[PDB]
């Protein structure tokens, strides 16, 4: 009928020659929709395969000896690491911009801005700006509640005043999610059960200033839930953002499936939530009203990034299939109005988000 979301397949890494074996969390990265790095090993010559999303058919291969590679969100500047050794190269100008040696192994790192790399070690989190001659800065000490977890994600609000680290572990025969929410201003951490989340800016009607929101999904003991709350003291003169909560569904077949990704379109004010096993959920950022929900991938999804173009969400799955999902501006309203029979939400989305 009509869908309130458009789905699209942009690539099949396997048609590019990549080995399925390297299509996974620890060997294929996608820091942004502009590139995809895959570490393969032909003979004992490990090497990275960079894929320009604008030239899928021309992947450049280069010998590397890094245990991890992560291309910058906006340019052919790449971060490589080997143990405590970190180097950033400007591929195009064939040079090493910066280099640093950590006094701990980095368990997980990722770009969190056009110029800043976040480094996670077993017990602390650092931010490393490429701006000038800067060296890692410890942002905060890991909370004991993540001790032992496999770190899977780090996120930040816009002003980098709220940080969210996330790890997952097996407990009770179920994937449990552990998150640490740290406030740069009040120097305080907060343990939160959660699997996926993201931050978002939002100007409530009647508010002069925007509001910083923290939205997370969790499949806890009470099943699936999704919260949306305002983080920190509201801007002077502003107003609270009512905390919102709504469960996230999980059919009976998906018994040990859980949330693995979350992008938020500030363009439509919606929350895309993907589960490990191919489920896509649409939620209104404002009310938390679950707009849509179906299955976009039979293979598991391990990585995603904002699809800037559509204001949606892009991602790779275990088969090498690169797919996206965005709001189908042409019908989101009609769908909400008719199919969902939610006149209020629809009247609001249109007006609010000028659809």
């Amino acid at each position: 009928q009509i869908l309130p979301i458009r789905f699209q397949e942009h690539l099949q890494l396997q048609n590019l020659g990549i080995n399925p074996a390297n299509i996974g969390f620890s060997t294929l990265t996608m820091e942004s929709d502009k590139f995809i790095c895959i570490r393969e090993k032909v003979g004992e010559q490990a090497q990275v395969v960079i894929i320009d999303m604008n030239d899928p058919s021309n992947p450049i291969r280069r010998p590397i000896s890094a245990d991890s590679a992560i291309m910058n969100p906006a340019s052919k500047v790449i971060a490589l690491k080997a143990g405590k050794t970190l180097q950033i190269f400007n591929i195009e100008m064939k040079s090493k911009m910066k280099a640093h040696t950590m006094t701990d192994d980095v368990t997980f790192w990722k770009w969190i801005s056009l110029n800043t790399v976040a480094l996670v070690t077993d017990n602390a989190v650092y931010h490393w700006s490429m701006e000038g001659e800067s060296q890692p800065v410890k942002m905060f000490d890991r909370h004991s509640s993540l001790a032992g977890c496999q770190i899977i994600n780090y996120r930040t609000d816009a002003k980098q005043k709220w940080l969210l680290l996330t790890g997952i572990s097996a407990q009770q025969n179920r994937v449990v999610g552990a998150m640490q929410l740290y406030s740069v201003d009040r120097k305080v951490s907060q343990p939160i059960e959660g699997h996926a989340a993201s931050f978002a800016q939002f100007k409530m009607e009647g508010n002069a200033e925007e509001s910083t929101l923290f939205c997370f999904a969790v499949r806890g003991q009470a099943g699936g839930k999704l919260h949306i709350i305002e983080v920190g003291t509201p801007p002077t003169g502003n107003q609270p953002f009512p905390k919102k909560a709504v469960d996230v569904f999980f059919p009976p077949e998906a018994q040990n499936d859980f949330p693995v990704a979350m992008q938020i379109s500030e363009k439509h004010d919606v929350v895309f939530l993907i589960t490990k096993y191919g489920y896509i959920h649409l939620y209104d950022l404002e009310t938390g009203t679950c707009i849509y929900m179906n299955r976009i991938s039979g293979e598991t999804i391990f990585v995603t990034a904002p699809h800037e173009a559509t204001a949606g969400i892009i991602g790779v799955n275990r088969k090498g299939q690169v797919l996206s999902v965005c709001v189908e501006e042409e019908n989101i309203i009609p769908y909400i109005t008719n199919v969902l029979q939610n006149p209020d939400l629809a009247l609001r989305m249109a007006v609010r988000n000028n659809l």
Binding site: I78, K81, F89
Partner: peptide, 9 residues
């Protein structure tokens, strides 16, 4: 020292 990346050279 040694580079983690080799770009011809």
């Amino acid at each position: 020292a040694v580079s983690l990346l080799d770009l011809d050279a």
